[model samples]
Target chain A: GSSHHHHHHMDRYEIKGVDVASYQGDIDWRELEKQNMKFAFIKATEGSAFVDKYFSKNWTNANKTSMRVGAYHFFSFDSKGETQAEQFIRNVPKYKQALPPVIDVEFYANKKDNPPKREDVTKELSVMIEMLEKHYGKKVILYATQEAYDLYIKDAYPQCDIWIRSVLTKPSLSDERKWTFWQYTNRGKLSGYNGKEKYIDLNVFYGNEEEFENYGM
Target chain B: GSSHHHHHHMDRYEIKGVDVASYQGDIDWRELEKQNMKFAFIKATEGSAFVDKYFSKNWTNANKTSMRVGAYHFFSFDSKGETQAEQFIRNVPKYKQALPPVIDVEFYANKKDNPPKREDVTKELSVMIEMLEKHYGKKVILYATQEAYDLYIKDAYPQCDIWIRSVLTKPSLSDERKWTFWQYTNRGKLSGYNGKEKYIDLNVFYGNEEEFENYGM
Candidate 1:
């Protein structure tokens, strides 16, 4: 039906992109660019110990296209902040052409009980952010679920560029804070990537292309 | 069906256990022990950048049980071995009570085409093993699929203990080498753990309980 149409209707946030990982199958970066995907955040690492299996190939291919590329690490609750930062540094090369690095924080299965206190979680995340900012010479972006943000991160690191995940509607943050990036859907589909895995994560930058260039710097 | 029917009937290699990650859900260590689980290898880290989100909680709770516990790092093909080793060291603590550490190596989806050459894979793996061994003050274990074993790890680092995964049949190694641990099934089930995630990886040690004690040292 027309409800499943791909194009976004006029809204405050318009810059379009997708976040991908190995599960996305082999990406056709050229075709993705042709489809007007303006930016891409590729999963680069996880915790303090895992380079995503497809990161290198995806990063290389994405660089060959017109997309503004960024790397993200899936933050781990079980690892220390500095160590995870070092892991990200080791895997993600500092490229002047790339967007600021991202740290994706979310809840894991069965970890609801006995979570680190808010102060501890923030302390650890702060260490990772500081280290990454020092190494990359750019401020880091934080991508978090609403629960994670409300429970641990919102008041902890206000200086971070927040990327909130709100699938059905725009996110409403406390204190009327704005989001730098909004992940609008997980069931996004794109053409020209023809492997078994389909459905990309669709996102929107809160500003125009010119502002995005400045933000990346 | 009777409960005994699901148990292995083999006379030799009778000690059984499972390896777990967050994917396994919250484990019931007491129930696992009651099921005659003699040991466990909890996933600790992957590559040089990711500690398993469940490692700390699993390790802590497993220590409360009688299960002989070890930690395994999921080896990343794209990461440097030394960095990965450091990442492992950062997460896994040294305890004389713990079993020897393990490096889990296997193929990743879409990574088959551009894997490091055999020599390169071995060289990188050797670095990780050597560093981990030096830090832990014990020999490390190598976990691999048949293809990975044959292609890169078989002859290299022969002093290390080997854990082979062979689901359908027994692994037949060249030169009549014996596996220290064999993962025989991924479709394992146990009682007293009522989590939605039920399946666990089941394995058998090559020797008896007495030898298992010495091996942990």
Candidate 2:
């Protein structure tokens, strides 16, 4: 695989992270920071109803790690999106400055019976996103698995920065889809956090360190 | 196995527990209480050396649970026994009421060259045990795994009530000699803790619930 010259001049990239909720294991925030992770997006609320456990502890400890941390609310059409948004806000308070906050609208579109009728989903997502954006005054990063992106927000929200979840052992250009951040892996290892064992994730901005530092945060 | 000695009185036994150190998981105390766990033996200190991480948390939470609690020092022979006893007293402040504290001397002989000779082992155990009993005004339990007991304490401090750590998941052998409390298992499932999982243990005592209740604060 021969390399081709890129347009962006910056060679050093900054690292970002994604904290998946209730997935497989614990996220070692301390170890992630030690590896020079600059910012993180934590799973705050899930469904239009369920709140993630460890949201409070994760964010609280993440703050002490001095990383720019934001939260994402999982969307579900079976219930009011605003209610879910409220739960997210209650559990994860607003940080002074970070990404506008993400809305994860993947699974809602999968279940056929509750397809969140296109128009209704747009209207509800708009209302929820607008509320959070206006309150926090930061542009939000829309996060989704690749399948979810293609299925739902690919056409509707083209203007928002897409944070993609894709784990790759070696760097590849297959995911060069105008993403702001890429979650490369979830089963990462790090230090400072205590347990018999720990789990972590690795991420990075799509651009240079300067742009990462200036990332609407 | 259908013997006719069934008695309702024999079926209902009083609750008992033995707190372990890093040797066991750093369990969430509230969850342990929810399991109807009635007592704990938290790690207070270890000889004149290491202190267990959750000693304070266990000590404080024990009060809230109304579970009679006791403390023990994991024994280490490298440090002078008297110094370790002082460390335990300084680190573990006296609780309003506690089951008599314990002298735990287990891993000393396992080391390479400087294993405390037989006379020194018995002398050190007796020193701390005596100091704690004199200061706390309570008879201290001597906790040991069967191997450790057989190697040292059995021939040494026989007057002390033995809190045995026996992982065999069966009724204590009838000829196994009387013990104050028997730790029958270490793997217990419980709830109400922060993590997705919990840690627990089990014990059985020689007396009734009233007798156990009358023992400590």
- What lDDT score goes with residue A187 in model 1? 50
Every candidate's lDDT: 0.78, 0.62
Quality of model 2 by C-alpha lDDT:
0.62
Q: Which candidate is the best by lDDT?
A: 1
lDDT of 1 by residue, A36-111 (tens): 8899999988877777778999999999988899999888778799999999999999988899999988765324
What does candidate 1's lDDT look like per residue over B145-214, in tens digits?
8777888777667779888877545555655678889887554755655522244688999898889878
Stretches of candidate 1 off by over 4 Å are A1-217, B1-9, B193-197
Model 2 residue runs over 4 Å out of place are A1-217, B1-12, B18-28, B108-116, B169-176, B191-197
Provide fnat values for all models in the order shown.
0.00, 0.00
What are the TM-scores, per candidate, against the unseen true structure? 0.49, 0.46
